[model samples]
Target chain A: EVTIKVNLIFADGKIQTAEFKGTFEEATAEAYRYADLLAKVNGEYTADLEDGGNHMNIKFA
Target chain B: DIQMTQSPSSLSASVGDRVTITCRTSQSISSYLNWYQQKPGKAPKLLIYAASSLQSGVPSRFSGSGSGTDFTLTISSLQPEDFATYYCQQSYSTPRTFGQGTKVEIKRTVAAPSVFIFPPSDEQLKSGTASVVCLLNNFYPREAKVQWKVDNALQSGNSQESVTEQDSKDSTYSLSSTLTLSKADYEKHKVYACEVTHQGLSSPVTKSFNRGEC
Candidate 1:
């Protein structure tokens, strides 16, 4: 299974995390799911992946 | 998903030489390309990201350009340590992937491998299981054999070896491997050896350690 680690960064500078671990299709769906939630809440999103290090960071508004 | 191909898999040059490596993608990826430099046994250092954006702190001499399906990583003037391996990666779609690395070698220079053994921490020694990192340094030509032995027997512990960092000033490489062992093995005072085979060496370069040393 793949783990999509998402971090939520709100306008107030507080941070939260949301994670999705599943098949590729499910992962993509969850990504969209969160994207909509962020839009409804009026937040922005950013992501960074380190080379060879599977560690990823996702920031959302 | 897009695939990448790096040309001239390997090349030889001298200090002050101009070096260029090309990376081609299977399809248009716009400016989503990145470049990395790896020496003998360290973590890959990001040189450029998003085609032309240089990562903070990377030397100005290293630059990247191009977009869509073609990209390039150029070293304006080769330093003694720039003779390592370089890789290009794409972040355009799912299953992000990288190009097969290109090795840059110093013309006519063959150097033996140097190894560094990071001993286990006191906490690990006390916990009955420990992990050690064996770093290979100052190697040239970007190819070498790294093997681990426990009590002269081949070890099966989790290990990973790769070119991770290039000496931006010397053109040398820093590569590494890691090994994890159980407390029982440590209690036995097993001898662990990191064996490296390189074309420049007449014999394998062996770095060994025991529990007492840790």
Candidate 2:
């Protein structure tokens, strides 16, 4: 099992963070789904991710 | 969402040597591959993106090839300054991922770029027109950017940077940029700085000069 931590930044300036636990592929898809929902909060969002020791940052338009 | 794996975790090579690093994705990612070089403390510098498409300003010696789930980053002739860590990232889907870095060690020692500053003359300083030169020499990869700032604020000065030029003897690259302050806004103790951004650097290298020196 893998645990993925995500930091979400919404267009309205609110910030939220969450974690998903699953296989690497599953966790990645789950993280994207959560980010998509957050983006709709104000029409856009950004996510900074930490999984294991790897890190990634993404912006949703 | 595919997993990226790289092989030969580390390597050793001499100047002018040829070396290759490989990256494999768990599934077909089409051509969404990218490559990066990371020094110990710096952020990963993008080298290639979209499989074989070389990023602008990167040296001709640095190239990428392969498609589908397999890709490779090749250095046709390694320079001493090429000794560092390299990585591969895939962006075909959300939650992009990077491969474990491959460390390249030089069989011999190589020196990093040395930066020098040429300050404006007193006459120009008083005329409210000034220019500063940020000269960087002996760097590798050939892709770099220079930024100017005054009092911690970004300066949109008239600036020009030379393309990375290679040295015939050492095979290394050099770059230089000059920023012209069309209307010098010098204040007592105001600080002016030149920040160099490079793939080998995690952050921009900065050099500053204070107005008191003028």
Interface RMSD, every prediction, one decimal place: 15.7, 16.0
Report per-candidate DockQ. 0.01, 0.02
Residue B26's lDDT within candidate 2 is: 94
Tens digits of per-residue lDDT, candidate 1, B1-214, equal 7888764455556667545566788899999999888976689988899988888988888877777987777676778767678999999987899998877665535666777787678887788887778887787756688888878988774777767444555656678787877767656656878888887779988888876765
Report how far off residue A60 is in candidate 2 (Å).
49
Candidate 1 at residue B60, lDDT? 86
Q: In candidate 2, how many Å is residue B146 off?
A: 44
- Tens digit per residue, CA lDDT, model 2, B101-175: 777654323335667777788787788877788898877655467888878888664788785534656656687
Worst 10 residues of 2 chain B by lDDT: B105-114
lDDT of 2 by residue, A1-61 (tens): 7655444444444333334456767656756654554454446645564445333444555
TM-scores of the candidates are: 0.47, 0.40
Q: List CA RMSD, all candidates.
A: 17.8, 15.5
Q: What TM-score would you report for chain A in candidate 1?
A: 0.58
